[PDB]
Design a protein around this nucleic acid. Structure first.
Ligand SMILES: [Mg+2]
Ligand SMILES: [Mg+2]
Ligand SMILES: [Mg+2]
Ligand SMILES: [Mg+2]
Ligand SMILES: [Mg+2]
Ligand SMILES: [Mg+2]
Ligand SMILES: [Mg+2]
Ligand SMILES: [Mg+2]
Ligand SMILES: [Mg+2]
Ligand SMILES: [Mg+2]
Ligand SMILES: [Mg+2]
Ligand SMILES: [Mg+2]
Ligand SMILES: [Mg+2]
Ligand SMILES: [Mg+2]
Ligand SMILES: [Mg+2]
Ligand SMILES: [Mg+2]
Ligand SMILES: [Mg+2]
Ligand SMILES: [Mg+2]
Ligand SMILES: [Mg+2]
Lengths: 188, 156, 65, 60
RNA sequence: UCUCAGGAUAGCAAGAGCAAGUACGCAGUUUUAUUAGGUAAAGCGAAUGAUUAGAGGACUCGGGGUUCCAAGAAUCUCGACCUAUUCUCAAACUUUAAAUUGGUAAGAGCCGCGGAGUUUACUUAAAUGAACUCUCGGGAAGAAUGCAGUGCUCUUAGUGGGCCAUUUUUGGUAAGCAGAACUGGCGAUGAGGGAUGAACCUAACGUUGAGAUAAGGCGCCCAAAUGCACGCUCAUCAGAUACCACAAAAGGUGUUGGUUCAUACGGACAGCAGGCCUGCCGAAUGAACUAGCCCUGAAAAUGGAUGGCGCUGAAGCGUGUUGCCGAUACUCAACCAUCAGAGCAAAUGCGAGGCUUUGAU
């Protein structure tokens, strides 16, 4: 249980993804040289986890292995303003029992970390995806001209109203909990 | 296995290496061997006499006797959870000198030299070799190559 | 009748149980596999070498020669 | 501070790598390859919930 | 071993001992140094063996059909020979060639074509060589890590039908079949979890209290969340998960995602219209795919088994997040016993197969 600072006060409401930048270099490590540095953006729940994500992708993308290189640094990135709602696009590859797939997904959230967490839960529930399998190709905070999904564009209007049609009874604290009460609740 | 005979299952071990057919290899004829040297033992298929049992091919023995056509060597075989000394006699053909001591002597002499000189200056020199060690702190100024995970594509 | 023909299962462990015994390195080794030529030489060169202490009556024999 | 000078350059500074590690035994005794057993024994974790220090070596 | 339900024989096991427990020693471990190997793979425009496709060819090796006229020449058809290729393969093929793994080593019993010796069918033309002795010169101890398992004697019990799991494997359509390899395990073994149950998961057991756990759980039977957040699902045959108690080829205008091509106020799709086009209507509308849950494919004999109740704002499927419950393991103490520490004479508050203590088990 280690929180990143930009996570909510209630741990419940969001997953423990954080967004990392990791960068490393070919091991020989020649001093005065101007090294090729390999840098990548990973989403993980740890520094360790991030390192893994890093290396996996890196050994797939290029010749390098870990005994062949060194980790220069791992730096968590944060979201600018948690005051506004943004529409995020994400581009994925994941692995389904048959084959591998490229998906584009959109979520309306306050954080790119939130965008990701929601992405994972969704991908589990609807697609039975395994986290380890998921590869996020590219992520963009979306400009309105660019938002393509109906359940996304669905929420743009000021005239938005939800009645709350059914209120399921939920006592305020536990101190108030009773199995059986002397009269029936209401919905509304 | 239904058959047990001195050469059983000797097929590819003893076949001469590619394009080795009929190589006489005069060098082995000339190699000098001494009672205490370490020999590596390697069979050649053209020379049938003084052939060791396949088990001993590629083993490292210690020389023990020297005969006119053959070097007596010493190897050990694990048998029923114990080691058993075996005195081999190899014809010159199937024997070659092992570098396992050569390395040692070369190293030692150089090292000893270093230590003697240091003893001259009051500096104790140590010859102990340390294995790979955790990397020292570093500064890095370089060009950043930013990679992104590729989309999947099928090549048919 | 039916039996299990050859299994090497428990035998490896059994062998490692008390350790693998290795013989003792003895300064002086037996003479097996050493030719008689060399051996006679050793015998002679030892008998005649004064820097090698013999028995008393032996030295008598050696000093007479 | 090294980190700071780095960050400002756009360059980065890698601290020297840990020379001391700690290990704790997660798993029980039963049913283990004899090699594994002995490796554990060398690391001096002979039971569950045993921590120890070790150097960091190609060896270790 | 006339040996196959048995015997010996090694191995495994116990007790009594020996030795300076060469720690510069030891090791089912790495590291470093020197080295082996022909398996996996791959390779057959490379050898051996198979083996498809088309074309060319000055020069070719023969057959046949064609034609002409005539026996020749011209020419269609075959293959064989190259020419440049090409399809698919080998446990009894192989150039190439791994991972895992095998030898031997990592110094005082070391290193150095420096010395002086000893050798009567040892070596050489050769004080040449060789092997051993006494010398001369140099040599911080020559990797990590661990050592509550030092080496060896002596005497001897039981055993000699095995069985299972992961991975690898051969015969077999197959089998809770028959055989093999490495490591375990079960037998010889309990405790908690898989409702249940030899070989699965945690975990290895002296008597006892506390705490925090593993495996697994927390709607009730049941300790602990009818917790807090996500996605998906309505079954007139839902579903409910390792080893585990089975389902396939094949299908669905059920529902939700995603992929690739398309339409639309220079008014689409559809319907109604009307003569390919055109009006009305009015913002979204096509097509092929893919994978989730759901539906069909899905027949058996006593009455029935996600373990049972029952569960659909889940008590279902794939996740997120926090706490809590929970072994005979882990902590901490008390007691018992085992093994090992330390201390007990001019003695003495008591018994030396003793007393006092300490750590592990
Ligand atoms: Mg070979
Ligand atoms: Mg043994
Ligand atoms: Mg009987
Ligand atoms: Mg016996
Ligand atoms: Mg004893
Ligand atoms: Mg030591
Ligand atoms: Mg090994
Ligand atoms: Mg090799
Ligand atoms: Mg595996
Ligand atoms: Mg069987
Ligand atoms: Mg295994
Ligand atoms: Mg195992
Ligand atoms: Mg029995
Ligand atoms: Mg058990
Ligand atoms: Mg308790
Ligand atoms: Mg609820
Ligand atoms: Mg039922
Ligand atoms: Mg059912
Ligand atoms: Mg159940």
């Amino acid at each position: 249980v280690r929180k990143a600072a930009q996570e909510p006060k209630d741990d419940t409401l969001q997953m423990k993804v954080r967004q990392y930048v990791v960068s490393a270099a070919r091991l020989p490590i020649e001093q005065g040289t101007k090294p090729e540095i390999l840098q990548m953006r990973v989403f993980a729940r740890d520094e360790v986890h991030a390192k893994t994500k890093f290396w996996y992708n890196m050994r797939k993308l290029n010749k390098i292995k870990r005994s062949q290189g060194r980790i220069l640094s791992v730096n968590e990135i944060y979201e600018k303003s948690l005051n506004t709602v943004k529409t995020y696009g994400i581009v994925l590859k994941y692995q389904s029992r048959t084959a591998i797939h490229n998906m584009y997904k959109e979520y309306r959230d306050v954080s790119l970390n939130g965008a990701v967490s929601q992405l994972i839960q969704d991908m589990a529930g609807n697609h039975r995806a395994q986290p380890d399998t998921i590869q996020i190709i590219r992520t963009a905070t979306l400009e309105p001209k660019d938002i393509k999904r109906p359940a996304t564009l669905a929420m743009r209007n000021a005239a938005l109203k939800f009645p709350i049609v059914k209120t399921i009874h939920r006592p305020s604290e536990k101190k108030y909990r009773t199995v059986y009460k002397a009269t029936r609740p209401t919905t509304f | 296995t239904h058959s047990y005979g001195y050469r059983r299952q000797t097929r590819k071990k003893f076949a001469k290496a590619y394009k080795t057919k009929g190589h006489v290899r005069i060098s082995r004829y000339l190699t000098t061997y001494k009672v205490g040297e370490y020999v590596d033992i390697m069979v050649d298929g053209s020379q049938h006499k003084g052939m060791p049992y396949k088990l001993y091919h590629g083993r490292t023995g210690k020389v023990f006797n020297v005969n006119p056509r053959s070097i007596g060597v010493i190897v050990h075989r694990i048998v029923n959870g114990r080691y058993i000394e075996k005195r081999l006699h190899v014809k010159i053909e199937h024997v070659r000198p092992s570098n396992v001591k050569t390395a040692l002597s070369k190293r030692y002499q150089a090292n000893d030299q270093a230590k003697a000189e240091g003893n001259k200056a009051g500096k104790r020199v140590s010859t102990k070799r340390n294995p790979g060690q955790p990397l020292e702190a570093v500064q890095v100024q370089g060009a950043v190559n930013f990679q992104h995970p590729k989309v999947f594509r099928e090549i048919f | 009748a039916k039996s299990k023909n050859s299994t090497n299962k428990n035998q490896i462990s059994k062998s490692h149980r008390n350790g693998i015994k290795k013989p003792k390195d003895h300064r002086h080794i037996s003479t097996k596999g050493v030719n008689p030529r060399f051996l006679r030489n050793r015998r002679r060169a030892i008998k005649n070498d004064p820097s090698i202490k013999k028995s008393k009556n032996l030295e008598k024999k050696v000093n007479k020669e | 501070d090294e980190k700071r000078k780095a960050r400002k350059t756009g360059a980065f500074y890698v601290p020297a790598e840990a020379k001391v590690a700690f290990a704790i035994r997660i798993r029980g005794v039963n049913q283990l390859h004899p090699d594994v057993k002995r490796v554990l024994r060398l690391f001096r974790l002979r039971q569950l919930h045993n921590g120890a220090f070790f150097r960091v070596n190609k060896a270790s």
